[PDB]
Amino acid sequence: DLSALNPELVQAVQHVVIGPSSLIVHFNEVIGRGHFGCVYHGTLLDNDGKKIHCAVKSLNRITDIGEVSQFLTEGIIMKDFSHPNVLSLLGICLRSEGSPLVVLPYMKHGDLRNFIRNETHNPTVKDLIGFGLQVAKGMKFLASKKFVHRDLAARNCMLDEKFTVKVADFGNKTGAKLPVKWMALESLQTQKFTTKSDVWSFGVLLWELMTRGAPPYPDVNTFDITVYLLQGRRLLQPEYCPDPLYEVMLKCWHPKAEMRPSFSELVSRISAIFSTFIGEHYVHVNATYVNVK
Ligand SMILES: Nc1cc(Oc2ccc(Nc3ncccc3C(=O)Nc3ccc(F)cc3F)cc2F)ccn1
Structure with a gap:
């Protein structure tokens, strides 16, 4: 028709x-x-x-x-x-x-999450920060066109033959179908999505990158994530995540949406952290996160 x-x-x-x-x-x-x-x-x-x-x-x-x-x-x-x-x-x-x-x-290498999860792959701190930077660059472009992603996660980021990350999207009032674990406090409470809430999602995406694709908040039930966050909690610093990258994650998770860095600032900050690494530090999978869904 x-x-x-x-x-x-x-x-x-x-x-x-x-x-x-x-x-x-x-x-x-x-x-x-x-x-x-x-x-x-x-x-x-x-x-x-x-x-x-x-x-x-x-x-x-x-x-x-x-x-x-x-x-x-x-x-x-x-x-x-x-x-x-x-x-x-x-x-x-x-x-x-x-x-x-x-x-x-x-996209030869498929999605970013399955790529980093693959145990035959040997990423370094630099490679993973590199992927995060490429996602930030893509998001900087999208934010400049006033485009709000709503579901930014490593599962929605594509990887090609040259290892270039392509931000993508694979694919109800109070009913659940939402990616609550990547969602900003204001977006879980009200149901509104902004560039600032994409910045919260980006912080979780950096966590997925540094843990080699571990599921966020495993112990936490989807229906009570708001209750969990309001107790004064954030995702723990991954074992191989450098302190300045963790500090950037905490900035993406600022309780005041307007206090969060813009994607332009994230590109700047992450590009500096990336430039300090040479490809010496190998990132290994966490035993407490293996086979955890
Ligand atoms: N192995 C492989 C697998 C692939 O699967 C796909 C991945 C993403 C999409 N995505 C879409 N499919 C239809 C319409 C729009 C999009 C999409 O990603 N839109 C989009 C792009 C950028 C954004 F920021 C937000 C979006 F919503 C489609 C695939 F077939 C593809 C290649 N190589």
Whole structure:
């Protein structure tokens, strides 16, 4: 029901349209089944002959056009996201069958959390601070466009062949579906999200990086995180996290949202901490965090 969509959404999608002849979706090759949204390996033909590797996001399909319109908006939101540290949109493919297809450049190393969790990987303090800095650069760009992420976490950050981090997003009044453990105090209490609350999320993301992907607050039930935080608590300093990086995390977790550093200041501060390291310090996984979900 393409005509019942929205003429402005349809014209915006038209400028990023992919013809069904120039895209081959390998439905047998799944890049994570996820939930009610699937990602597959894809081949895209660019201009002439070019056989580029891509990720194709789908699913499919209950409400008349409501979920299709939201799906197309999420993809169209990426149009002006051109920054080395933010995931790009190759385009959108309109299937003459069912669900429209969102086409993204392939990220060889997948998500940042599974990458750092992998025990065959040997990151140093510098590499992990490096990833945090790249996320800060991407967020600095997004904040300058007044774009509020709402779900910044290592699981939503993508890693390519050159190890360049691409900030991305994989995918109800009082009902729970929210990433409460990455959420700012004000966002848990009121349900409002700002750049300052993304700064809180970024601090948790730095914690995930320094612990090599440990789940935040393991002992704490999702429903009582506000009660836990208000007792006067923050995540402990990871074993391999340098003191000035911990101090930056505590600044991201400032109880006054307006007292939190901006992403521009975080880029500056983290870039200085990063420059002091040479790649000597190896980061090992914590035994108390292994197999902890
Ligand atoms: N192996 C691999 C796996 C991949 O999976 C995906 C990861 C993220 C998205 N993300 C999206 N899918 C559809 C619409 C928008 C986004 C998205 O990330 N938007 C977005 C970008 C930057 C932001 F700050 C916020 C956002 F919401 C899609 C994938 F297929 C992809 C590649 N390589």
